[PDB]
Amino acid sequence: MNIRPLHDRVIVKRKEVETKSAGGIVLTGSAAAKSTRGEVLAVGNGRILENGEVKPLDVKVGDIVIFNDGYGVKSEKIDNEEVLIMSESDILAIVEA
Amino acid sequence: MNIRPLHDRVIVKRKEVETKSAGGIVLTGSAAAKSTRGEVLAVGNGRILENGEVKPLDVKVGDIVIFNDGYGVKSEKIDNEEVLIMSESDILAIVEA
Amino acid sequence: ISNIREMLPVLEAVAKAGKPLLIIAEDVEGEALATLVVNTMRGIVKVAAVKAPGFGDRRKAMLQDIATLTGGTVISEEIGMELEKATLEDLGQAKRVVINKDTTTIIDGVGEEAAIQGRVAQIRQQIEEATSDYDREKLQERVAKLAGGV
Amino acid sequence: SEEIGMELEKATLEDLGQAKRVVINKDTTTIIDGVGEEAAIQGRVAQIRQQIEEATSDYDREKLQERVAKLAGGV
Amino acid sequence: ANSDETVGKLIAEAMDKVGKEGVITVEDGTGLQDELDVVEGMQFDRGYLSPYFINKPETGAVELESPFILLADKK
Amino acid sequence: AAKDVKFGNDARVKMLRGVNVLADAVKVTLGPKGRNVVLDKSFGAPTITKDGVSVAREIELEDKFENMGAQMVKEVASKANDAAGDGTTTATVLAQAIITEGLKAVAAGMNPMDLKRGIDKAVTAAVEELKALSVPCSDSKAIAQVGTISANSDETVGKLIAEAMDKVGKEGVITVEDGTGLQDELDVVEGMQFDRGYLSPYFINKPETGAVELESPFILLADKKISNIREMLPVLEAVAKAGKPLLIIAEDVEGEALATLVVNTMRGIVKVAAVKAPGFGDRRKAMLQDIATLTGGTVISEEIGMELEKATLEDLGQAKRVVINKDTTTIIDGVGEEAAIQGRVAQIRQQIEEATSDYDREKLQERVAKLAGGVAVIKVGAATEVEMKEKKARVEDALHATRAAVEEGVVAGGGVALIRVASKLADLRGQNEDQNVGIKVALRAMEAPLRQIVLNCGEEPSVVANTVKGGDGNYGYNAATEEYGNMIDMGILDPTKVTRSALQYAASVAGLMITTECMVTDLP
Amino acid sequence: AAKDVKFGNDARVKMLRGVNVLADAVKVTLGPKGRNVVLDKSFGAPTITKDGVSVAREIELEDKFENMGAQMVKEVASKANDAAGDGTTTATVLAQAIITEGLKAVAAGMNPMDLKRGIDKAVTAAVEELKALSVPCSDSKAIAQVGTIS
Ligand SMILES: Nc1ncnc2c1ncn2[C@@H]1O[C@H](COP(=O)(O)OP(=O)(O)O)[C@@H](O)[C@H]1O
Ligand SMILES: Nc1ncnc2c1ncn2[C@@H]1O[C@H](COP(=O)(O)OP(=O)(O)O)[C@@H](O)[C@H]1O
Ligand SMILES: [Mg+2]
Ligand SMILES: [Mg+2]
Fold first, then answer.
1. Contact B86, B38 (CB under 8 A)
2. I want to staple F65 with a disulfide (CB 3.0 to 4.6 A). Which of F2, F14, F430, G77 is the partner?
3. According to the UniProt entry, which residues carry N6-succinyllysine (chain D)?
């Protein structure tokens, strides 16, 4: 089954644990560090705060995103796959172009 | 590929680790200190806070800025280049003239 | 001397006069020294640095000797002074200096023999009221380093 | 060295030494035939020449003579 | 060496190869006969930091040709 | 401290009483009619032994000078033993002989430095002569004969040694340890096995042995401690799909991981077992590599930047069966092709060549055996502890002499080889007369071991030596049967390397000693 | 430490007095007309015992050689006991007996290593003999007899 994040929470999936390429030709062996990029899988209707109306989120289903990996984020398992649940407050940018 | 900061976040690049000149003729060797100046590469649409409307940021793409280097700021890598991601809350001034 | 900041106003007044500089301080540690070393290396300003003579109380008095011989002004935080507020004028001067692995030597100081002879006439009576045998050796040494030879 | 205020990062190929072959064991590295011109070799040897002259000690003398040999003749 | 022609000869021989600025040291031997080692040029007392570098396991030692050398005066 | 200095014949005389008290305690044990010495111990019961270097190490004398004597000849016996673990009494006997004679000639007023030169020349010559009489010992029978003769004529030791040497092959280790009962027993473990038990007694699928057994199992080699089960999952499940059991040899398996493994194997999920890695420190990783090779698996260490999670079935080693006890894992028949087995063996071949140490040599030879031949253990039987000690020592002793036979050959025992090289050098001469006596001094000592063998039988050394000297080749005196004959045919073989080390070492120190003119030491 | 070495008959005689002091303390206790020995104790009251391995463990002698005698036979009594917890006196008695007689034969000029082989042969044969005389003890009455006689 798939997931449905509650208003303002966003469901994303992590990317590569130090993709062995950085710098150029040199395949940097894992230096004890994690990835901050991720694919957005689902979106909550949007933040309700301050009563009057409910604003959408500025990320769509399937965007590529740099987030801030911190306390806001949680680790979960869907069909046995590594997925994260943070709020848009934690999403920083979108890698495009 | 290039980057697209999420509303209110700003993407900047750092400048010189104690440019060897300060004082005058003397090339001050690195004293264990970093730079607070930087070039603005991308801008988020702007802060959404308090529902009603969404105000732009007062920094444009390509400004030179003094920011406050602190917790608000994060370190990332684009095409293999050292770029930082803080919100306008952390930008203090713009060096012009 | 730990912070190079303390030096800058001075080091640069010297870079403008185009003359080299000796630094005799209580000590020159990591942060300051390193940078001095980097600055002298690149052909910026010709400089050298070397510990002060002896320790304890005589250091200050003996560093004063050095002041007198070269017509400079001792910069201590005791009279409430800062390195930063020191123009070229405070600096001593000589015609040549020579320093080894463990030996600094100043040749021919700018100090007028009016002031040289005077400071010598003071350490003249230091020995007269030196009520000890060890407090007598050092004074006679200094007298020789300022008057005759060793 | 970080003593002259230097960073590894700011080092082009040019800073690197070079040789024709190197051989290293469990406890022995050895460089065969270095690119350094004998102009500079002979010079640095003429410096450690006088290190021994003013080596006022017996133990500060052994090491210098060693190095001379590793740079000039053989061990 | 109390009339030991062989000592005479080995000394003479070493003196000849390491030249005039070369060290000669004596240490216990493995077998019954005296033996003279002469190391050619420059070499010091340091092994690889990981036995993985070893591109020739038959010697148990590392070998590189025309290599650049990075000299870092720091950990 | 103030010293007591002693000069010429005076210092020598004391030196020689010194050599003598030792030499005599050592002699009593020489040959088949050897007798035993008892060496006391503040520890516990005394020690009864026949073993020259054991007696020798104990001798220390009260006369500071006599003592110097003794502490110097003591080294022949000591080196003799570090060199071939046998012949140490013979060694002793030749030195007491080279000294006795040598000194007597310094009293005649020869120049001892020349006495010495001739004694060495004599000896260098004798060693060549031995290499020339030496014939290879390579059938199982001869090997038994060296063992047997080494073990004071214990045919059973000869045999057992010969037997082991046969099964573990040429690159196999043989070790001796106390046995349980009264009779000697030879164990031979087949192929590869090390000192590690299951990490939980729950893995045990066969309680009657008290031990674990798996067939066609995959082998997970992890060069790292295992705490998180997460690290395992991708793997454990690839194995559950192939329906085969799994051995886990890691640096260790602790609480969290282990517990769960234990829970998973229990419920009949996947058949698994786990056991610590062999040894510690640096060899672990190299030795775990051995296991990789034997079973055609890939070591998974965080050193090459590897993660357990990223390991398919392919990385796993494999074998046909494994057997693990309370403290013993053993892998039977690994999948590794003998192309790769033989290769990794050809590497640890030269590990020993450049093993500049004695302890860095033992381990390598062990591994070679666990990968090539087999490992054998002998258990010595004895009624008592006084008995186990002396017997065990002899087996040990002969274990050595056979290893020596095999690498260097055999010559005629009962001191015959030496008595024969002595007539071969009847014509040796040196640069001057003193050296000529010095030569003759050694040739004469060369008779010593046969002379003592005989005297220990209570017959007359110089009648026996005369008749032996009157014969040829390998004619010699059988002390045990008190009859003459061919010593090779009678199986009285000395390993050449020992007969030669006896001569070398005894002359090497006897030589120096007879050139004492002053002796310095402490006041009483 | 400097050592005292003793050879042949000299060393054996000492050896034997050794065996003897020990053997004789242990013997007084053999059989139903056994008597007791008293072994002192720095601890508290002495110990009266009939039990050969108890007496044996105490004997240590002042002559270092007589002592080696005693410390050697002492293991027969000791092993006998680890093996069946009984018969330790008898064992001691037999050894003193094998030794006495044997040494007497070494003095006759026999070759001890053979004296030994013959003693062992004699024994391996005796042990077979014993297994032959042995009849099972399996009723309660016989068990009580071994108990009782023990
Ligand atoms: N029946 C025999 N006749 C003569 N010599 C024998 C006989 N059996 C063994 N030997 C000899 O015993 C000598 C050494 O035995 P051993 O007492 O251990 O002296 P070591 O400690 O010097 O090995 C060897 O030279 C061997 O040839
Ligand atoms: N009435 C008896 N007549 C003869 N021997 C006896 C008698 N009772 C017991 N024994 C014997 O006593 C011997 C040993 O008793 P003990 O003094 O305990 O010696 P140990 O310590 O050697 O057991 C045994 O041989 C047993 O046969
Ligand atoms: Mg032997
Ligand atoms: Mg009883």
1. no
2. F14
3. 20
